[PDB]
A paper describes a structure:
Anc1B, by contrast, is composed of ancestral H-, D-, and K-subunit proteins. In addition, all ancestral proteins crystallized in space group P 212121, which differs from the space groups for the same proteins in A. vinelandii NifDK (i.e., WT; space group P 21), Clostridium pasteurianum Nif (space group P 21), and Klebsiella pneumoniae NifDK (space group C 2). All three ancestors showed anisotropic diffraction: 2.65–2.93 Å for Anc1A, 1.82–2.8 Å for Anc1B, and 1.82–2.42 Å for Anc2. Among all ancestors, RMSDs for all atom positions are largest between Anc1B and WT DDKK (0.36 Å; compared to RMSD of 0.50 Å between A. vinelandii and K. pneumoniae DDKK). This observation may be explained by the larger number of amino acid substitutions between the fully ancestral Anc1B complex and WT, whereas only the D-subunit contains substitutions in the Anc1A and Anc2 hybrid complexes. Furthermore, we observe that the position of the twofold symmetry axis relating the two DK heterodimers of a single MoFe protein shifts slightly between Anc1B and WT. The same was previously observed in VFe protein and FeFe protein and may reflect slight differences in the interface between the two copies of NifK. Additionally, two unique single-point substitutions in the ancestral K-subunit—K211N and G307N, specific to Anc1B—are likely to impact interactions with HH E111 in the ATP-bound state. Positioned centrally within the DDKK-HH interface, these substitutions alter the electrostatic surface of HH. In Anc1B, the substitution HH S177G is located near the interface with NifDK, with G307N in Anc1B NifK identified as a potential interaction partner.
Residue numbers in the entry:
A (entry chain B), B (entry chain D): 2 to 523
C (entry chain A), D (entry chain C): 4 to 480
Amino acid sequence: SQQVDNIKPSYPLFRDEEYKDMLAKKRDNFEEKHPQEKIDEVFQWTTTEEYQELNFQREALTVNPAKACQPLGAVLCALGFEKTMPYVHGSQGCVAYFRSYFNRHFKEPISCVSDSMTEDAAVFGGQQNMKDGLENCKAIYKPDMIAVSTTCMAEVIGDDLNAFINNSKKEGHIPEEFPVPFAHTPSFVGSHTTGWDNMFEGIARYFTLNYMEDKEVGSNGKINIVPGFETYLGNFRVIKRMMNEMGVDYTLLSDPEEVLDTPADGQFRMYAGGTTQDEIKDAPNALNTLLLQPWQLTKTKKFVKNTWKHEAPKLNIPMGLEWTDEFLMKVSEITGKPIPESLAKERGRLVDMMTDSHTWLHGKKFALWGDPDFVMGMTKFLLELGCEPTHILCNNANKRWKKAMEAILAESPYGANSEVHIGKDLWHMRSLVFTNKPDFMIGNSYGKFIQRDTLYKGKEFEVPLIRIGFPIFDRHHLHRQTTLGYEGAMQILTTLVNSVLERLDEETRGMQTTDYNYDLVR
Amino acid sequence: SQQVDNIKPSYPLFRDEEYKDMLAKKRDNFEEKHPQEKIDEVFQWTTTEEYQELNFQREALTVNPAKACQPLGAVLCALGFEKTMPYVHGSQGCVAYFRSYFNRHFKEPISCVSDSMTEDAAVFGGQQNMKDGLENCKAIYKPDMIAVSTTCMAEVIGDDLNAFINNSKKEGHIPEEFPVPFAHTPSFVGSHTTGWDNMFEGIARYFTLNYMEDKEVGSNGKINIVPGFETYLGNFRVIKRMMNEMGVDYTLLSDPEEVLDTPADGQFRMYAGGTTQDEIKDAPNALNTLLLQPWQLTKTKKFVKNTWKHEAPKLNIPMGLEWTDEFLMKVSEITGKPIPESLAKERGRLVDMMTDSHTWLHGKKFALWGDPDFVMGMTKFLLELGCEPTHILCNNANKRWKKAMEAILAESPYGANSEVHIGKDLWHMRSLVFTNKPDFMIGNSYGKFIQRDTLYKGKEFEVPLIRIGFPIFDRHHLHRQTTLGYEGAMQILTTLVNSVLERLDEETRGMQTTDYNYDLVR
Amino acid sequence: MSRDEVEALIQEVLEVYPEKAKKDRAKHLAVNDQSVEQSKKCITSNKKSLPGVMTIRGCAYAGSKGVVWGPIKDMIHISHGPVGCGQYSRAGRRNYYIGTTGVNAFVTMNFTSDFQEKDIVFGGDKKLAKLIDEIETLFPLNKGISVQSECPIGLIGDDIEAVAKQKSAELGKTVVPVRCEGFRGVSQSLGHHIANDAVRDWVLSKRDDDDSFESTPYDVAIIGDYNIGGDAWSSRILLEEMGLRVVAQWSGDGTISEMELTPKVKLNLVHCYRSMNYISRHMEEKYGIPWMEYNFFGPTKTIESLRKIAAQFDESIQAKCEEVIAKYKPEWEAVIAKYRPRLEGKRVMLYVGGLRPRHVIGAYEDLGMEVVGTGYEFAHNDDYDRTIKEMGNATLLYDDVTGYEFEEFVKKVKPDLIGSGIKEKYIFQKMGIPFRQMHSWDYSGPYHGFDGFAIFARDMDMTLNNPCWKKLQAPWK
Amino acid sequence: MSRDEVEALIQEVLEVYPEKAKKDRAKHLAVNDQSVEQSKKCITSNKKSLPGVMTIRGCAYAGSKGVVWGPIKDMIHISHGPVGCGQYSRAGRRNYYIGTTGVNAFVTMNFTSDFQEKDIVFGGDKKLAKLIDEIETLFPLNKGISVQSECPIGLIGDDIEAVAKQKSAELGKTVVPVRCEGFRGVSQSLGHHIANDAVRDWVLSKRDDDDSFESTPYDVAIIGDYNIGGDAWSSRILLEEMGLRVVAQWSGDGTISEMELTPKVKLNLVHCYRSMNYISRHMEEKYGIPWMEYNFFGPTKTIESLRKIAAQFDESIQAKCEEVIAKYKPEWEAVIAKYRPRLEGKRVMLYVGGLRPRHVIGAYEDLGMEVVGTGYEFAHNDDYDRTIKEMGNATLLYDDVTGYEFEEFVKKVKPDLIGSGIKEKYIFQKMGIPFRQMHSWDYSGPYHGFDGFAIFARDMDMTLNNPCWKKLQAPWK
Ligand code: ICS
Ligand code: ICS
Ligand SMILES: [Mg+2]
Ligand SMILES: [Mg+2]
Ligand SMILES: [Mg+2]
Ligand SMILES: [Mg+2]
Ligand SMILES: [Mg+2]
């Protein structure tokens, strides 16, 4: 039944006694369900250190990974160029999914085409796809550039993107001087981050490899900033704000911030803002190039040293206090621009918030996951806050990263009880939070199922999720936040200390039980 | 018992069996407590319609008010002028509390002096205190201005502030030219808001009342902006941001934002930023004067019309979409500066967010309280979002404001089941949320105890608190947020909808019970 | 808009295309005419998508793993290949179920073999075999496993069938190989077929000899309701109230045992013809189980469907049917009395997958709303045949519509509401057009049955009449 | 820092003052000598505050309402007058209790008469009477009422005493008028006294005739413990394990019944001398109940105190005292084992109210920390007398310290830690000095007793050795 004044959706509709009566008969008669007792027994077993040892013995099965596949990053990279259509050479299934995944994080449109390779193209490659694909895309969606990446199919059959593209030009499917950067993005190597790096280097190479003879390091008096895979709008904004406050002439290379945040003012705009073709063409004439997320820009780093002759600084991601300082001092060194007082104050303000909130953050234990650079930067910041990052996991990281993390951990007394896990997944992470229970998880929306599992064991065992990273599907507009710089540190600290105080208020709301500590002031 | 590797503060220390037994024995032997059954029966009765009728029949008892006393406001106003010391002429116990109350909201130092009136002043008056206090305060703390307000003591005995100040100057206790604006701030009239307006009007008078001869409206090209009592830093910041983007020359009259947010960089700065005495002196030359919170700026309005000859425009507080629109358009009209595309875009992003989130917000019932301008502004925005503001209370508002609120509610279908309460308190509010349960409260930290009470009736009866307003003492750094303009509307929307989704996750996290609706994507 | 004007719209949109694409697309756009019984006369379907036009369609993996298998709550469904596909489809679809996830049900989890390069270069058959062992150790209460092949499995020539057979006999548990590689077919549609076939060949025969199940005259199965937002439960309650015993649901909240019991029922009740007609026919041929199509969107369709269902049985059922109707009569009447005035005369364009573009039209019409255009990602001509009498005259139809086309149609048609997918949602909101997700139900529903109707009507109204839509224009322009 | 160096500091700081103030303050600043027995030879106290100097002190309303009466959980305490005082004092003091707030307990609520102009002009006696009827209707399970007078009550000539006696006779409940107007006295101190005198006059003699209560030889009461963070609970435990029966706690988690039963006890244990010396003397004179001052901050003081308490009783209790001491021996040793190395040699400046500036010195010292400066807001010379032998030679002592004086001292003295109030806390963090709240315990605690010492130690370490303090310098400066 529904009453029209009080219409119930799935929850709490299905909680009505009749629904509940029904689902129980369904179970009993036809579903052949294991005994609840059996269920509880197994559940209790999945929480043990015994299960944990089996879990960590896995060599072949992956469960609940914290990573995606290269072309997801190829696409995000491409969206950052002016009037550029991302184009994924291969099967259309992949592109349906790329678009939806980004749609749900950003609650925005995501524009991406496929050349719809099918069974035919296995026998005889995807040359016809690339020809008509390019011509169709160019006529219909009117891009100024098409940035080509690949699905795993086209990787496996061995489509040569380079020749395929040139032939399309040769037979008039598209103009001679129409930009079609390309990159090979195999899903079975690395991750979405690796795809960002490849697409980026693809586009840098396309525009500058053969134009170096007339270039001169420092000639345009700027610095190039390269963001990598970035899904907070406020991270693009905060870098641009800081450089403008310093009077630093800058070029952001791959800047999706406009196109990820168009106004709802009556018109759809498939394209908005982004790096211009001039900026990428002019990019070698910069003083130098900063890599904001160095662990995911291996290839880009190499290209930029070897071709452009920019000796890119070893900067960690500008997260927390020390590393934002090192970023700003390095920019200053290079640009000769002094760091203004405005920035000294913002920094001072962060420190004041650190002093204000330390009693609550101190000794607080965290499980953490996400992308390598993010994870490393969050870990740094937690150490600065007097938090224990007990369980640090990065699904898409190598051993070099693990060692550099163990180094950061070894430098802080708050890092004594931590362990860095690489190539593990959220099913591993689940066991960890049962056997060595932290206060909170920092992660993406996937961590909510871990939070549901801890609760079934008991409220005393529940680990609340603090959502920071990618993707975040079950809250709205978190993608407008910042995690880089002093601003990002402010926001992070706010979220952590208020997460602590929220949980405490939850445990002390029990009237005449725990509410002796339900304090008005904290 | 403490184990050193698991040291428990009060919670959870006193949940130990040893402690619980001790507390039971304490109760049973000596406390002569009413039986629990009796306690529960009365509790139950307090949730009823019957009890609500009784509760609303109160003429004399006030319980859990949602306002403070005037001089609290005058202190805040005065902090907003350059190198200015708040001085409350009256009992010193008053100022200890002003300081602490503000210490706990902003997590900042709050500078304020008293002249410590005692028994003796009760007959002969506080002339002696004014003399010595002015002289001591100037020598010790070196302000360039002393802003004088009153405690209730001094109002009741009738100290003439004007004469007392003149005699302090006549006997050489302070220089004759040293600025000492003053106001009578009686705690038994209106509230802290009234105090702000009294203080502001006193400072304006001091600097301009006898200096109108050489003044021409518009001659300095600026517009004046008078914020009223504001405890969100972002609100000062967003007004100035917007005026700068618009290329508008403005003077913010009472700017406490530097001094309520000094950096932790090795040194304490008692004074920081603020409106200059030249600004307040020059203020009659502005084109006009905008009052950001008009319901609390009665006296200032009269003064500015009558003395300065500014026709202060009839503007609601610039909260939500429509009223931000009206503000910016009125600024444009007054200044001749067009509204730039940057603000148009920011507008469109807000509308975008609205479209994206409207499904979670539709028909969500809110209780709220706070100051009259804020409450009116939040009510407007909730209607713009398709939310029902069922319980609207403003302890410190008059019959004129209530009628104007009913006018706003009547224009919107979402306001058809709403009721406005004036001069009521949070014990009244407790009844409302039992008898006609909303989904959430919007309010200050005092709301948490209402939330406590609702849970005890049961989890299905619990009404969570959304902390927006003043004061907020049990969460940190929320004072840095914004409620004004598009930026404030964005921040609010996010909090509201994430409040809905956080609650839903909790209600559906129960495995095999309600977690059929524990969706990854929302 | 007249037929003439609509055909001029279609011509003007087609101008943008290069010649080859233009010739193809002209065949996938039509103006409805109710005289025509042969939909092939006006429109082609179920063809490959043009390169580079931004189709909305997905792949066979989606149709198989995403749609048919992955809902089945007590089996573990491996995404065999690189990590992408399993991660983008994890919990993306609200196929509701009851279970203890990680223990006895696995729907919202992501099991993959997560192929690295050496898995590509030397094959993954042994990774897969070791994988199935680790499942058994770590998840002993699973009642069966499926292998959902991603693109590279066919291309490097892995024999998953060989592993399925070994591990199945070794464990005493069904292991189903499924060749749903993304390159096969042209859409999700072939995935449905491959998956229906996997059921047939690897599961549905399990209880052919076993006669232990106690039947009744009134046993039925719900074929093709995937329980989006509790949709099947809303349906299910109405059939049980009507006298019937619902032995199985495929595949919403469904189980392996439920599937293996389905050949024992009397009647198959097909909601989604498109995805599950294949198995419904095999069950008629092989078991002599009849099947009928039904529709549970709105009270008109629900009342009709309930009556047609009950007619397949005796009097006692038909009587019990008239009581389900009588009992909900006041409920749906109230829903209409409140909501229909707020929606009367409003126009709607739809675009969904294989059923909803036709199925939900009566539900709109019960609220006085008009569907002025509809279409499918991947339907076949038997779908468009069923659509002809469901839509008005001179209404626009579109098959495998392109990003560009759908926008141009919307600009010219100027609908009050659009009901489509997550890739479409944020486009049309920006244009100021109310939008309801007609796959995810915008995280609402159920929309099936009488209880779903209240919700659907509430939803259309909350979005269509939202104040947010009056406010897109800055007042100083 | 020599004695001459600190004398010089004081002179330096005194330079800022006009001559009048300069002469006053000079009498309120001292360098400790431990031969001195009579404090008054070097510091004056309990005087008027100077106008305009930014004293930290509060009022007699704070001392009565906020400090003494508020904690009493089963009574309703009316802030009588305008609305400020009760608002600012609502729940700012962490006087912990067990109750159902709003039903049987009322501590964190703000009851007020909320004076308007007409209440000033025409008196609030009729308002007050009406209010007390309303309390009886809306809060029936209250066990009595206090009326906490605010500044105006005494200046307009209201007779609350008259209303109290009338209401008390008519309700059969005690109604206590308290003349704690904040103009009275100079500070919180007189508030305490006014409040102790209201206890005596209006509550304490209520069971003089009644000897229904069963006394034992081991009955005690804790006097002057307001249960900040569970402090009195941390203390109660040790006394019950030592074999005493604690009949009463004044006033943290206190009830009117236990106040009324305190005349039946054998000994009064006074934690806070300043606030409740008055009532302890009254109960000595009137009931012949002995009383003794005690100290439960840190193990050295807790151990001394237990034995000193145990000696007032027989040998059964003196045995149990050694068992308690033995049981907690390894626990406090672990705390020192861990924390003293992180804190050895660190220097502290305190500033608090009437007790904690001397009382907590032992707890620091057990962690190898030296208190190099200490002061009180509103203490009398008897307090300073008891401070002499706690603080070491050549240490700084200050009374009613001014905002200016404390800043300047901290800059010159450069402490490693500062322990003070909320108004001080955010000044010294920005200067770079670790700061602990010595009133609210920084939302932590308890600090009393063995269990308290672990938390105290943890907190001193967490704050003094925190990473935040190394970062205040921008590294490009
Ligand atoms: S299975 Fe099919 S696309 Fe019939 S692949 Fe798709 S849950 Fe659609 S129109 Mo998403 S043929 Fe179901 C469908 Fe309809 S996933 Fe759902 S909404 S009724
Ligand atoms: S009562 Fe006094 S100021 Fe003895 S008014 Fe004050 S809860 Fe202090 S040093 Mo706040 S004489 Fe108690 C006190 Fe000491 S409120 Fe607490 S900390 S031990
Ligand atoms: Mg249920
Ligand atoms: Mg959006
Ligand atoms: Mg603190
Ligand atoms: Mg601060
Ligand atoms: Mg502190």
